[PDB]
Amino acid sequence: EASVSFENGKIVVRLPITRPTSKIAVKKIENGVGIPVSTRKKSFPLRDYYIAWQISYARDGKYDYELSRMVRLAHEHGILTYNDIYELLKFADDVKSYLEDKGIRRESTNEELYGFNIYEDVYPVAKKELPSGEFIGIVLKHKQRAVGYQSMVYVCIPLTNVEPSLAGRVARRNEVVKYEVPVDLMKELLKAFIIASETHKNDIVKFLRSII
């Protein structure tokens, strides 16, 4: 439900902010944790607020969706040079372990709760912050209905970096905002998928080699 385009020499994405889903939701960040927010009820003050986007690179087996759509448009308009794709391919070739390798572990402690021993389940999370304010997250979740893991990639875009400014008001009905996607972001998201798992890497490599 995201809309990717090329406008004014810039890759832009238009994102809805009032219909929260697994894929797109506005969050308030406190101590790392992302509190959900309803953008229609409470008014905005702002550095605390992000669009949380679980971004994809394929759909129906097609690599012309969200991230891959942004990349194709960038490469065709010289935002993403052949040089950039080469080094991302080099990065990928150098990557030998993944977030999925780390897995999820259960550790004993020396604590009890009224006679019950306390253990801690430890989930790995990979994160990078761009100087522009965007966050990239890679979370490991226990694969639904199946053994093993799924790695999920998120981009977190501060409300201060979108237009129009939501400052001082509730979102309008079906409000959609526009975000100019910086080349750095596309690079780092491709890198995130590369390290998320070997199967995500193999996909990204085939796609970028596809851009030739």
Partner DNA sequence: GCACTAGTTCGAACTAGTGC
**Amino acid letter at 19?**
R
- Say whether residue 148 binds DNA (CB under 7 A): yes
- Beta carbon of residue 74, minimum distance to a copy of itself (angstroms, whole number): 20
Contact criterion met (CB below 8 Å) for 49 and 75: no
Other beta carbons within 10 angstroms of residue 141's beta carbon come to: 11
Q: Of the two residues 85 and 99, which places its CB atom closer to DNA in the complex? A: 99
Q: Which is nearer to a copy of itself, 60 or 168 (CB)?
A: 60
Q: Is 131 in the site for DNA (CB under 7 A)?
A: no
Between CA 141 and CA 123 the distance in angstroms is: 8
Cβ atoms of residues 98 and 191 within 8 Å? no
CA separation for the pair 200, 87 (Å, rounded): 17
Q: How far is the CB of 145 from a copy of itself (least distance, A)?
A: 7
Single out the residue of 59, 143, 169, 209 in contact with DNA (rule: CB under 7 A): 143
Binding residues (CB under 7 A) for DNA: these are: 1, 18-23, 38-43, 143-148, 170, 173-175
Which residue numbers belong to the known binding site? 54-55, 153
